[PDB]
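Morning!

As promised:
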Amino acid sequence: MTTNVALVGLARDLAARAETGKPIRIGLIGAGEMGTDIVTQVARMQGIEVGALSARRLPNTFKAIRTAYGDEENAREATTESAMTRAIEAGKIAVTDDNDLILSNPLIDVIIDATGIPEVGAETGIAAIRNGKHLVMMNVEADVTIGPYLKAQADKQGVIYSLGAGDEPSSCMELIEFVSALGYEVVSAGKGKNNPLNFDATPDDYRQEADRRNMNVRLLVEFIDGSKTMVEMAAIANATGLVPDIAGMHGPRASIDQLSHTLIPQAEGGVLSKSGVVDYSIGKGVSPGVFVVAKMDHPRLNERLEDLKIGKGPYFTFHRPYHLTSLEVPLTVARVVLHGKTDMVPLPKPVAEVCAVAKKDMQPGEHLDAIGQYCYRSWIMTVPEARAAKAIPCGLLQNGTVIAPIKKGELITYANAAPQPGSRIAELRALQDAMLG
Amino acid sequence: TTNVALVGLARDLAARAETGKPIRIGLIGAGEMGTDIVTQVARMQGIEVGALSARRLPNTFKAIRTAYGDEENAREATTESAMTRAIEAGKIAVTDDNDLILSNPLIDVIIDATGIPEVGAETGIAAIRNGKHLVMMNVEADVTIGPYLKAQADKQGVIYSLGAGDEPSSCMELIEFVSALGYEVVSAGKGKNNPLNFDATPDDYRQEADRRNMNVRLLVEFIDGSKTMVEMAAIANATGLVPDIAGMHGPRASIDQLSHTLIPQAEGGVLSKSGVVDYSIGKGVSPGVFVVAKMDHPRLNERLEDLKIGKGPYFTFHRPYHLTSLEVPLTVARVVLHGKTDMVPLPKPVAEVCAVAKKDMQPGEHLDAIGQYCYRSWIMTVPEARAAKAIPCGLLQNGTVIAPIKKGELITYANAAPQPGSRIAELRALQDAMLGQ
Ligand SMILES: [Mg+2]
Ligand SMILES: [Mg+2]
């Protein structure tokens, strides 16, 4: 009709949900780019709606709705529960500047924080779970810091925790599930980037592109300096047991057609010390999307994949050549609510830690700024290596205090820096560490 | 073996293994596809081949020896009590009598891997009659009598599905995704590296078939387009997409050109309308399958452009692999564990696989078989096939020519008569009666 095709699978399940007259209802925190994308995407779908939308400043909620629909007719201001419930019952998106109204409204099935602020994702995440709501996490920086604790609390409450679909970590998990259900060895998994990283990048280098693209300069810097890649790969590690092969990963030069001879063991001509890793490639054809390199262990299976022109064995590349970011998150919401399935959760025992390296020399008393700025960049390590070094989890570091001189390129540790101790995020991480100890 | 924690369907299969009662497949046909399935299941958890049949008993032992290295796991059974005792002993029961498999109480799901459409029809209705789920690999049979099989499965309370891993069922994965997200499916299908040759015969391929120890008919039906017509018809008949013209356009297009080619003429492509099955000639599409989708909101167009998915409003979604028989056990797992089909025909077919003569023939000659000398498949809409009195291609093997036929001419009830006594002609008449109601 709009789609040109009969209803099948999840599309059919959503249509059946719509026919009940009670759609799945998202409580959406954050009316910026990702939130506006979600509102826009849900408007094309059946059986799923945004019940309520919050922003720090109320006008930005109306702006998001106007961008999605071309006018504000679907928006209705609500600053108490009775007003929010009435709005939703009237078929409106309740808009508010009070997150707690969304977190506690009885008609909201699932919470998504789209602010892009890890501390807010932590705060609203534990609130969602305490209110007995399912939680879909888009903030990967938060997830790699406190995900295991959120997941444990979600299980204590009988709700589902999941990373949202459409970002490299969760998209890669689709490939991992497929290869592993078939009983094949996962040799390496990850993402690519078209151009080399620049670990020295700062907002001075990108402020011009940011202005031109009307976007947050920090998103550019964390892209170029490797930080986002380190985070995303750690999320895959911590959901699978795959490990970085070396701190920071290898990040070799490899096009899509070269992965199966590069991100494999050194004994077989690759760069890896062992099989079972997260890594990434620099080169053409991989981004957007994600990959798994799998090994065949039976000569007949090798021959079938060679006859099918999948590669030359025993290593083969499985590529998902797209990820739609925000746009796929409603699919996670549907799977959670209709099927009781998560798309991606951390394991109970993390295997990797996102650590941080200084981008510049700093003296005691200076404050560390923020990811995507001037002072530091993320750096993946195994948990044992991070612990030996007393590395501070990168997610804790914004506005931290330097307590001993730090040189450009040096690891940020509990010997040379101190997080702001009063954050929900440092306080939740302490609880996670106690749970794990 | 996999290097990763159990997630999703893998986890579901491991939990099934822990019950001590695996999913049990009854496998009919010990040739190449059936040997692939025995080999693939051997590296999976929670799923086993309970029994294997062949026309000639020694081929069952040969399949098992190719899978395992020796024939140890095989045990001949000639009665139900022997078969059940063999399965309970951890053996693969082997026989030359399909009915022993079809009626054994320990068998959960039947798969016919013989590659013979008539046998797929016969064993499929028998599997349903016996209250077993049915996974169909024979697409030639499915596009002939699939609707009837699906209706009879519904009456018995069992599940009918095409097996995963072939172009039609792989494409349905993409169609599900795009349509769940509410996007317009413009075109869907597969690719071929080189131009079709409609005049190909076994003489052109017998040398390569001998060299590769393979059936020459598989090569001829690939080259002459027959398999492509069948696979696109299966997608059509599961979705309501239609060939835009008899035989489809089959334009030259690489993977990067699909989104400007298999789109409407008004927008610079070749199609008369949106919502089709078609195929491309050129690089980078094969192996696997595509959907070209259209965006209907400028923000969603912008997002996909920013992600470098394409230049809008048309975008290509590619699954760059499909593993043939190796994925079929995933269909078995989803059917038995989750009650989900991977692919079913709609109740009302929209496309018919018809046939065209490859050479002049005179009355009294017999038509031979697909992949040989006399005829090739040719997709048509159902209304055009009806109007022309076209015979469904699946009925034609060993049919009688009853009026002169020229090279390139459609095979119709006016110029040929199918063998009337086949299970496939009989079941097709039943389907036509059911559709008349
Ligand atoms: Mg990402
Ligand atoms: Mg095929």
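Residues 139-156 of chain B form the longest helix (18 residues).

Hope this helps with the figure draft.
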